[PDB]
Write a protein that binds this DNA or RNA. Structure first.
Lengths: 511, 249, 701
RNA sequence: AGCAGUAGCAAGGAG
RNA sequence: CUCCUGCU
């Protein structure tokens, strides 16, 4: 029972890995069994205190919360996979039998006439024009014959890259040559960019109501008892009745339908190039219609792992003048004229090649779960309010309560816009969805450290005299993880403006 | 005549060459680690493969003989229901699932199924017969306890339950005879008068025993009185900033 | 007009506007390519924190050994982290620890630990994560690696009859004494391996990349052990698990209120309290297991003679462990056309094809390299002793130096909150620098960039930000609401269970419950292609239901997975859908759904939509097809033993003889018992008896 | 080309 | 030239 197998090599292994002033494990165990402490310990502790050179930094005397270093370099371009604000869509009343994506594509080939979609081979700007011109002509004559399979040409074999990967040679034969095929490895990092100035216009656009009504296919309401189900159903009805009309709902429905179609076409047809519409479906004057924003092309995904990065080509429908600063990766052509009754304004066709991935589909195609944090937020505000008042004031509190947002441009100092609480829930759904698009590493690190500085402002509000030990490396990490993601640079900039507006009252900051 | 059948299978499986080195080399406990050989890594995206499966036309493996005893080759407009690709087991569509559920024959088993789930119909029976009141909107909160949450009436302790199912269904290798038997053996005298003749299998019976005898005790944040009648209603009765309870009886 | 989402913080708390700053709705960050530089960064950066150069030569392993205790070359930059622990100091804090509570404390707790060790079966090992199979050098699930280890035993010398923990561990050390051990390679040939290679192979830990972690810009490497390192570590975490349960300054909402109120009752007329949120950095490169050998030699000074020898092997395997080096790197020419792959083996010979950074990492790890691995002796990598370092945290938090200026606090894995009581602010510099002194000696490096302090409760502890009165709740993962994907019946009730357990523990206000319930309803319907009957969907499943809806009398008794509406609510999350819905069905519909004679179910909720899809198709098309032959054979023998023992999935089937002999003894047992009160027939008894005798002559042959 | 982010994908393998 | 893939 009480005997462990005393082996021969293990006992020579345990005697080898003891601390240094000991010979064997037996000497170590016999000293540990008869160990009594002393008070030369405090000499070792204080002798460690003396050789330290470490002082805390107060904040009432050296209130050194300087602003963050946004890179003053070239402005960061528009890097989202689709177009949000600059969109144009063609409509038709929705037919129930013709509901699959290829049927929608053909029905909009007859609705919005592509015969008039004549493109010159000279773009306004861009990089490769003949490739995109013959690509649009080739896919347009493909949709004219009602079959989604691009026949092998040099244009698609240049754009959706086939044969463009290195020859992976294992080190079993290597056939070395004297000073020929000189090989090694090399990495960089990332390139650095600057503050986006267009992000304010698309944030303000995305929270404004759009007359097309409901966009997101939600579900039906379960039946309610005499309980708090009246409360929860009432809250879902008001919040849902605000978030269905905005443009954030339109972009979420666009991602759901389009990435649904590209996703199942990534399953059912690997190795074949497809033609996929880019569309929505929303109710117009009671009659449910569908939109049509653009044309996507897959690039024969063989998705072995969760990565894989197949090639998507997007042809887009716009009615605005382009911009070599924001719309930098696009390859703007000009298509023609569109009659818009308020006269017959222009129509520009945008081009972009890009990539999606398999891990960046189940988080895009299922991005309807951005209404979970919003209602949590407004519901914690309102429930803490009636928890501090101890009286059922919810319906009248959702109308007579302000929320400070959106200071103006020339001046900031205590000139704020207080809105009603349902417009707060508009801004909250815009910011949560904006987290669901632009997530890279950089946004993750930036949200950690902004939780630190939020702790410092809350310590500033209630006069608690915060202190920190080393501030140089702190800004070295936050200025490390602000490089090139547009939401990262933007939220740092608004963090500085929060420091200015709070510096109009509290004392821990700079100008 | 089942021992002749099991003697036929046991005489069958010892004929194999490399399977003789499998049994009579291991132990009885090795069955447990002979049950688990799931060489797939983690199934880290199961719903992804479920949507990838249900988007195809024939994802499902189903039995052949019963569906060719009752089914139809295609429904009335192009809806495919069968394949002939592969043991004789036939791939099919979930349209055969809803098709069986709308145009298929029926077997009367309502009392049996309403007797399997007596704990859960007991939960529905206790839910339907309660009354509520207004809300209160106050702060509330109290620590985490170890609470038995079910209105059971025997209250065994996850130890007399496994031992109980040994000495009720199959006593030929049940357990070493302990001192915890005697009044539970009067309950053995009661319970073999229940589970002797049924058409329900031994695993489903072993499942349904352990839910009418086990007060499920978990480590939960509790407040108010600690009766088990209101502990399955823990998530409904109060949150953090609000509270509702007005039950009379 | 500019716009600023942060302005809500001007007149709110950080208990309400803090769920807004977690970007959990996006994708988690993934790793790409090899996991070599994270491994070399970890091991070489372990040796840069050693503060020494004293090498000791070894006789077992052919490589040098650097010690990590009591050999400190104290550089003046002591703000930089050290990885060197002085043993008299930490044993002094252990003797200072047990003199606080009780007298026979470690004897009591260690006796309860051994009171649970001897009553343990080793099927407990199969209830774990992935481990490293050393037969084929891969990552396998726990049951597969245990069965291959036991397979190497029963192939090598004799058979295995343990069925306990201690007999399995002693079987491992007996495997260490053998001069040659045989196993099976791949199409199943049988090879043999030496003695030093078995020692180098039991001590091999596999390194890989941590995939999907929210909270770092730089990626990190996680390591998973072998199989012969797992049970000893499980023993140590049973012991230190009992000790951590017994302590009261370890952890999470009540204990902070008791220590904050109680140390608010311990103030004099001029004293005050300051809390400091901290975060110990570089935690997995500054816990040497030699100190666990010494401290675990102090806890078990009076326990037993077995446990004293058995709780001192897992640190000894951690003190000289190997590290797998990923799979190498890749090279390419100037035209970027041909890209050769160099694995971890030939990295020595192709050293001169690396970058600047890779060579900077590789020339200071060169004197410790084996063929495929690297030799580490002083790290404690991730996925290891976790409930033991928290005991070091509690040991630092109960130092008694002799005014009346002192500290207390709370400790978790690498996150602490410290509370100080003093009189003046230069005394706060005195006491807090005494705290960084004692942690700096004992081997714990506090990070100065990520620590702060205030006067009242305004701290942060495992992402629960406690303000002056209110308490913030934890940001959960959203995809955990939808993880099932197994059935038209076992997904939605699982989702109602996840909203349930996320509602009871966390805050989770009711509107998030109704909304998140309704969204998971929508994704359930959207995956399984089933929509309600009055919706306008016309696909291959709703044409049937739209044609056949006239047969149904009561419409709202349909299942949701068949085109019914939703009836569950917030107050009905513990009832599945069917058990609410069985009171309203048609008799044809209820007698039709609940047929067990259906081709789908034949070959926790009601299993009447439960189907099994087809498998994948690399399961007979890779080179590992004989492994699928192995799983089919194991399903055959397990169906045989289940077909004899009619109720075996309830109780764990212990025994130490063989499987077939208990089968034959059971058929003769039921043959005699069902003979004399039953059967009675000579052709049946002698013919079954003939089949048993012939099967036993076949099995012995 | 491009997606990327400290190193990979842009097909891979066998007969 | 063909076959096989879809976490190996």
């Amino acid at each position: 029972e009480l005997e462990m197998y005393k082996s021969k090599l293990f006992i020579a292994m345990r005697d080898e890995s003891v601390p240094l002033p000991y010979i064997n494990y037996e000497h170590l165990r016999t000293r540990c069994e008869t160990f009594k402490r002393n008070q030369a310990e405090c000499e070792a502790k204080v002798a460690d205190v003396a050789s330290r050179l470490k002082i805390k930094l107060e904040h009432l005397e050296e209130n050194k919360l300087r602003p963050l270093e946004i890179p003053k370099e070239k402005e960061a371009p528009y890097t989202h996979k689709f177009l949000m604000k600059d969109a144009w869509f063609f409509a038709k009343p929705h037919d129930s039998e013709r509901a699959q994506p290829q049927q929608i594509l053909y029905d909009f080939f007859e609705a919005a006439n592509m015969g008039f979609m004549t493109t010159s081979p000279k773009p306004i700007f861009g990089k490769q024009g003949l490739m995109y011109h013959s690509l649009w002509g080739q896919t347009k004559r493909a949709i004219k014959d009602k079959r989604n399979e691009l026949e092998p040409s040099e244009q698609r074999d240049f754009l959706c890259g086939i044969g463009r990967a290195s020859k992976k040679i294992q080190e079993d034969k290597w056939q070395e040559s004297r000073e020929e095929e000189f090989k090694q490895e090399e990495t960089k990092g990332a390139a650095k960019r600057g503050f986006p100035t267009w992000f304010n216009e698309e944030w303000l656009w995305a929270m404004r109501d759009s007359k097309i009504g409901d966009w997101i296919p939600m579900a039906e309401m379960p039946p309610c008892k005499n309980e708090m189900e009246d409360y929860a159903k009432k809250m879902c009805e008001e919040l849902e009745s605000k978030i269905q009309g905005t443009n954030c709902a339109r972009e979420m429905s666009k991602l759901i339908h389009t990435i649904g179609s590209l996703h199942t076409e990534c399953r059912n047809f690997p190795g074949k190039v497809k033609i996929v519409p880019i569309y929505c479906r929303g109710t117009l004057r009671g009659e449910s219609t569908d939109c049509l924003f653009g044309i996507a092309i897959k690039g024969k995904s063989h998705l072995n792992k969760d990565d894989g990065m197949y090639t998507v080509v997007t042809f887009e429908f716009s009615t605005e003048e382009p911009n070599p600063s924001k719309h930098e990766k696009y390859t703007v052509f000009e298509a023609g004229t569109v009659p818009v009754e308020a006269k017959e304004k222009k129509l520009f066709l945008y081009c972009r090649t890009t990539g999606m991935s398999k891990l960046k589909n189940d988080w895009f195609s299922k991005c309807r779960r951005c209404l979970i944090p919003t209602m949590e937020t407004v519901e914690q505000i309102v429930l803490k309010e009636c928890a501090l008042k101890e009286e059922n004031r919810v319906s009248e509190m959702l109308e007579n309560k302000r929320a400070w947002i959106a200071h103006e441009n020339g001046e900031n100092l205590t000139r704020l816009v207080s809105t009603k609480l349902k417009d707060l829930c508009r801004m909250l759904i815009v910011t949560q969805f904006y987290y669901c698009i632009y997530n890279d590493n950089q946004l993750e690190g930036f949200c950690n450290e902004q939780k630190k500085f939020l702790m410092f402002l809350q310590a500033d509000k209630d006069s608690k005299s915060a202190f920190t030990f080393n501030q140089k490396g702190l800004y070295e990490k936050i200025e490390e993880c602000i490089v090139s993601n547009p939401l990262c640079i933007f939220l740092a900039d608004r963090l500085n403006k929060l420091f200015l507006v709070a510096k109009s009252n509290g004392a821990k900051y700079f100008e | 005549s089942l021992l002749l059948t099991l003697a036929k299978e046991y005489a069958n499986l010892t004929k194999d060459k490399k399977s003789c080195k499998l049994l009579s080399q291991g132990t009885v406990s090795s069955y447990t680690t002979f049950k688990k050989w799931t060489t797939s890594r983690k199934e880290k995206n199961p719903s992804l493969r479920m949507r990838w499966a249900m988007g195809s036309k024939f994802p499902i493996m189903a039995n052949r003989e019963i569906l060719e005893e009752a089914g139809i080759p295609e429904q009335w407009e192009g809806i495919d229901l069968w394949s002939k690709k592969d043991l004789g087991m036939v791939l099919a569509s979930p349209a055969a699932i809803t098709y069986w559920n709308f145009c298929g024959p029926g077997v009367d088993n309502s009392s049996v199924i309403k007797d399997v789930y007596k704990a859960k119909f007991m939960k529905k029976e206790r839910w339907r017969e309660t009354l509520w009141g207004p809300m209160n909107f106050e702060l509330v909160g109290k620590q985490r306890r170890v609470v038995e949450t079910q209105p059971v009436e025997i209250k065994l302790n996850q130890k007399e339950i496994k031992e109980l199912t040994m000495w009720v269904l199959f006593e030929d290798e049940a357990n070493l005879a302990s001192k915890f038997i005697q009044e539970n053996f009067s309950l053995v005298l009661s319970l073999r008068e229940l589970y002797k003749g049924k058409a329900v299998n031994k695993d489903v019976a072993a499942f349904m025993i352990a839910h009418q005898f086990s007060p499920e005790k978990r480590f939960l944040p509790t407040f108010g009185p600690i009766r088990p009648e209101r502990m399955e209603l823990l998530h409904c009765l109060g949150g953090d900033f609000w509270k509702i309870e007005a039950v009379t009886a | 007009m500019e716009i600023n989402p942060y302005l809500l913080m001007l007149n709110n708390d950080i208990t309400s506007m803090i769920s807004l700053t977690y970007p959990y709705t996006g994708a988690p960050p993934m790793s790409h390519g090899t996991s070599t530089k994270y491994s070399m960064e970890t091991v070489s950066r372990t040796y840069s924190y050693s503060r020494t150069k004293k090498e000791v030569p070894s006789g077992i392993f052919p490589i040098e050994r650097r010690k990590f205790c009591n050999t400190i070359e104290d550089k003046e930059n002591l703000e930089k982290p050290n990885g060197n622990v002085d043993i008299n100091f930490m044993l002094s804090l252990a003797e200072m620890l047990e003199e606080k509570m009780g007298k026979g404390f470690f004897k009591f707790c260690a006796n309860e630990a051994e009171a649970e060790i001897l009553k343990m079966h080793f099927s407990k090992l199969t209830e774990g994560r992935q481990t490293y199979d050393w037969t084929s050098e891969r990552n396998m699930p726990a049951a597969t690696a245990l069965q291959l280890t036991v397979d190497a035993i029963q192939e090598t010398q004799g058979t295995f009859k343990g069925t306990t923990m201690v007999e399995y561990c002693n079987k491992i050390l007996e495997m260490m004494d053998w001069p040659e051990v045989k196993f099976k390679k791949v199409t199943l040939m049988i090879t043999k391996i030496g003695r030093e290679e078995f020692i180098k192979r039991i001590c091999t830990i596999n390194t890989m990349a941590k995939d999907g972690e929210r909270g770092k810009y730089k990626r990190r490497a996680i390591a998973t052990p072998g199989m012969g390192i797992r049970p000893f570590s499980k023993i140590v975490e049973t012991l230190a698990q009992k000790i951590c349960e017994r302590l009261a300054e370890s952890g999470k909402k009540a204990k902070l209120k008791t220590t904050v109120s109680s140390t608010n009752s311990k103030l004099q007329e001029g004293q005050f309290m300051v809390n400091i949120t901290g975060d110990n950095s570089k935690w997995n490169e500054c816990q040497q297991p030699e100190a666990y050998l010494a401290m675990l030699a102090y806890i078990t000074k009076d326990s037993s003679n077995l446990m004293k020898d058995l709780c001192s092997v897992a640190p000894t395997l951690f003190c000289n462990k190997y590290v797998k080096m990923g799979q190498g790197f890749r090279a390419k020419n100037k035209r970027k056309t041909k890209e050769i792959v160099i694995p971890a083996k030939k990295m020595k010979e192709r050293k001169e094809l690396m970058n600047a950074e890779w060579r900077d990492l590789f020339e200071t790890i060169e004197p410790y390299m084996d063929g495929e691995c690297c030799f580490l002796g002083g790290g404690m990598l991730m996925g290891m002793f976790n409930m033991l370092s928290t005991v070091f945290g509690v040991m630092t938090l109960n130092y008694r130096e002799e005014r009346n200026c002192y500290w207390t606090g709370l400790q978790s894995s690498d996150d602490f909150v410290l509370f100080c009581i003093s009189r003046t602010w230069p005394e706060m510099e005195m006491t807090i620098l005494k705290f960084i002194a004692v942690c700096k000696l004992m081997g714990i490096n506090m990070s100065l960039e990520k620590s702060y302090g205030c006067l009242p409760e305004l701290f942060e502890f495992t992402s629960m930000f406690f303000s002056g009165d209110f308490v913030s709740n934890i940001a959960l993962e959203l995809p955990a609401f939808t993880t099932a994907g197994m059935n038209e019946g076992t997904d939605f009730t699982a989702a109602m269970s996840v909203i349930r357990t996320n509602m009871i523990n966390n805050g989770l206000s009711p509107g998030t419950a109704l909304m998140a319930l309704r969204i998971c309803l929508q994704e359930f319907r959207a995956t399984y292609r089933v929509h309600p009957y009055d919706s306008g969907v016309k696909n291959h499943r709703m044409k049937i239901i739209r044609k056949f809806i006239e047969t149904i009398e009561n419409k709202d008794g349909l299942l949701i997975s068949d085109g019914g509406k939703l009836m569950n609510n917030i107050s009905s999350l513990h009832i599945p859908e069917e058990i609410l819905k069985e009171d309203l069905m048609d008799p044809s519909y209820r007698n039709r759904v609940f047929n067990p004679r259906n081709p789908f179910t034949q070959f926790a909720v009601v299993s009447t939509h439960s189907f099994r899809t087809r498998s994948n198709r690399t399961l007979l098309n890779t080179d590992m097809r004989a492994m699928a032959l192995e799983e089919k054979r194991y399903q055959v023998v397990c169906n045989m033993y289940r077909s004899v023992f009619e109720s075996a999935d309830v109780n764990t089937p212990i025994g130490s003889m063989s499987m077939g002999e208990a089968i034959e003894a059971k058929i003769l047992d039921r043959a005699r018992t069902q003979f004399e009160n039953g059967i009675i027939g000579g052709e049946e008894y002698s013919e079954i008896k003939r089949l048993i005798e012939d099967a036993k002559r076949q099995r012995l042959s």
